[PDB]
Design a protein around this ligand. Structure first.
Ligand SMILES: Cc1cc2nc3c(=O)[nH]c(=O)nc-3n(C[C@H](O)[C@H](O)[C@H](O)COP(=O)(O)O)c2cc1C
Ligand SMILES: Cc1cc2nc3c(=O)[nH]c(=O)nc-3n(C[C@H](O)[C@H](O)[C@H](O)COP(=O)(O)O)c2cc1C
Lengths: 406, 406
């Protein structure tokens, strides 16, 4: 019998166990292929598909492009697969082709993708966000940094931030959010969460990174407010904590909540004198979030100020993650992302070997909980299989792909 | 402007030129990334996605599984992408979960996939077939060789071949097709072609390989008939030539017609005494097809008799292709398939270097026209990009995947 997968409205073969599951788990299994519990869920490995904007939506709606992109990766067994930044409001989109969730119909298109994910026994999350003062741009392949004009679908008069400070001369100048705007954003956040639950997502991630709205509020270089939302570390994180409280009130306690942070503005160098968001701030914020229902700290960085000075290279953000991990300990899970180019590096980052970027081969060590990968998956949707073979781990793959190699 | 792709009923960014296209074509460009004209079409490279049964259909209908599998590969730019063996009749299916095209509704599900293919500027074909005496089996991951019983969806009393000779003790014993059955198969073939054209396929491939119905008729080890369809080389290929004539009468002269042949039964060894289908027969058949509207000879082999003795390894079927190519010359294109594991081997097979399997690195040489790959794509849907990088060829990729690496 070609057993059907339960709980979905179309026939497809059951994948038991799901793709990406180590077939002979033992104490010698690399941590990368070890399961990870998070609230009610169990990821079968520690490789997460990072959220990746596709700039291919139709008035915020997914299309067959998204099914081919996500469905092709998800069938190859990432422990967790995260959908791209999805705006809770039209004017929160990065571009006119960004994913959105201000409409019930957008949720119904998302549902098609989570039903495919669940037909495979895979877990899928959604990153909710709002682009703030970086909103209304054009797709990056059209131009690294150019605005979407009103006739090209843009919305210059609705771009909003915590302060009336443009990111650059190439972006629009935002309106400073009134208290009414802040409340409208909180209401829209709640309405998008209900749509996300109804489409069936297994985890929600709060986007607090990459110079978007929530990152703009936490950083003093972009948030000059003098109300309850500015002027001190506690005020500047208030909006983030209110978003966490709203979320934890609405989603099931059984459901993991992730938060992606930009660990630093990369303005912590000599020559730049203004105050900025630093990894110490992110660590202190992590400590506070660990007690308010956030289960995982996705650690990225940068993209909040055009004068940033980034030291890039293999695993360049993992040191931030390890410093945040050292302060939250076992109170919260920490995931690292950014140029993790091998299963060996990944296994090193998770197990605390190879140094703070895990690239060293010699010789203590801060352990991390989860590895996150974006560009690796775009080049090879079968990255999980490639890393499993690189590390000598026999894994399950989809029945359709397996029997050809026996 | 994020220009829309024309001619499809959903918005998606135009890919101009399509993915897999060499960006700086010149006399030094490897033949593998050189364009190939076939009737009205131009493949942008010489890498074809081989047809691969998924055993995931619902009463012959595609599902979201097929969109995720095919759509994920097609967006990464194979010169041509071929859909799996699709039965023109219910009892022609390899298993109860095989693709089918005896219903208009099956054509409408196929259309969704070709609209995605065309939204990407990619070319897509369909392999039509009928499993003959190998019909009504279970998916191979359930068991290498076991029958689908009547309560497991099987159809023992309808399994049909040219002669009442079972493939093995593990298969059903077929009924020998009456002249009426042969006419019913020809009628169903015509009806499936119209559905294929209406779904918008760009090429049709006749499945004459792997021990299915048409291979059974050509080989004397499986076809013992004494009517116009047996007893001589000309009679045993008559059904194949009638299928070609029907096809060329129905599809546009502008549309390429492919035919996949099993170059040999692999019974041409000492110890086995019965007469069999050999590469000389396939070459003589190729010569006849070259004058009857067949544009490409897909060269595979085997799977018609359980006593076959296969000499496998890298490029093991390419010698057959080169021998068929030597007899048809420029009258027909020839493609090779089977353990082509590298862009270098592939480039060697097409350009006539590296020996008859292209694995040699030393030192004339029969040139081939097209390289076909199945398992390579399942492991890495991005194989075209991987082979382009291996050969030093700058290629276009989808906008969504490209800008991240600049
Ligand atoms: C095309 C593309 C789209 C991305 N979209 C998002 C996004 O929607 N949300 C997000 O938080 N990060 C996004 N990122 C950043 C990646 O998720 C990832 O953190 C970064 O690319 C570094 O990881 P990598 O080196 O594995 O690619 C995107 C990156 C790329 C290349
Ligand atoms: C899962 C699977 C399904 C296949 N389905 C088909 C099919 O439907 N039609 C066909 O002609 N060949 C089919 N084949 C054979 C392949 O197309 C190909 O000719 C063979 O696998 C050798 O090529 P490769 O070494 O590149 O995989 C299939 C092979 C596999 C592994």
């Amino acid at each position: 019998l070609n057993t059907p997968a339960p709980g979905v409205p179309f026939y497809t073969p059951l994948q038991s166990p799901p793709s990406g599951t180590a077939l002979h788990l033992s104490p010698s299994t690399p941590k990368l292929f070890t399961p990870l519990k998070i609230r009610s869920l169990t990821l079968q490995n520690r490789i997460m598909l990072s959220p990746m904007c596709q700039y291919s939506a139709s008035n915020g709606h997914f299309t067959p492009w998204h099914m081919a992109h996500l469905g092709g990766i998800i069938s190859r067994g990432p422990g967790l697969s995260m959908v791209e930044a999805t705006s809770v409001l039209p004017e929160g989109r990065i571009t006119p082709e960004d994913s959105g969730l201000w409409l019930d119909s957008q949720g119904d298109k998302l549902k098609e993708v989570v039903q495919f994910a669940h037909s495979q026994g895979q877990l899928i999350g959604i990153q909710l966000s709002h682009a703030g003062r970086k909103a209304s741009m054009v797709a990056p392949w059209l131009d690294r940094s150019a605005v979407a004009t009103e006739e090209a679908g843009g919305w210059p008069t609705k771009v909003k931030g915590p302060s009336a400070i443009p990111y650059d001369e190439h972006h629009y100048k935002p309106s400073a959010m009134t208290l009414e705007d802040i409340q409208e954003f909180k209401d829209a956040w709640a309405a998008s969460l209900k749509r996300a639950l109804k489409a069936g997502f297994d985890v929600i991630e709060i986007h607090n990174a990459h110079g978007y709205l929530l990152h703009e509020f936490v950083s003093p270089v972009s948030n000059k407010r003098t109300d309850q939302y500015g002027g001190s570390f506690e005020n500047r994180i208030r909006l983030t904590l209110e978003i966490v409280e709203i979320t934890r009130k609405i989603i099931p306690e059984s459901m993991p909540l992730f938060l992606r942070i930009s660990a630093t503005d990369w303005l912590d160098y000599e020559g730049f004198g203004e105050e900025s968001w630093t990894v110490a701030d992110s660590a202190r914020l992590a400590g506070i979030l660990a007690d308010r229902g956030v289960d995982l700290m996705d650690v990225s960085s940068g993209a909040n100020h055009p004068r940033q000075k980034i030291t890039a290279g293999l695993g360049y953000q993992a040191p931030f993650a390890k410093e945040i991990k050292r302060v939250v300990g076992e109170r919260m899970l920490v995931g690292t992302v950014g140029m993790i180019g091998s299963g060996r590096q990944a296994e090193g980052l998770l197990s605390g070997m190879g140094g703070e970027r895990g690239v060293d081969e010699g010789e203590k060590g801060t352990e991390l909980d989860l590895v996150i990968v974006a560009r690796g998956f775009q080049k090879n949707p079968g990255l999980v299989w490639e890393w499993a073979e690189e590390l000598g781990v026999r894994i399950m793959v989809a029945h359709q792909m397996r029997w050809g190699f026996r």
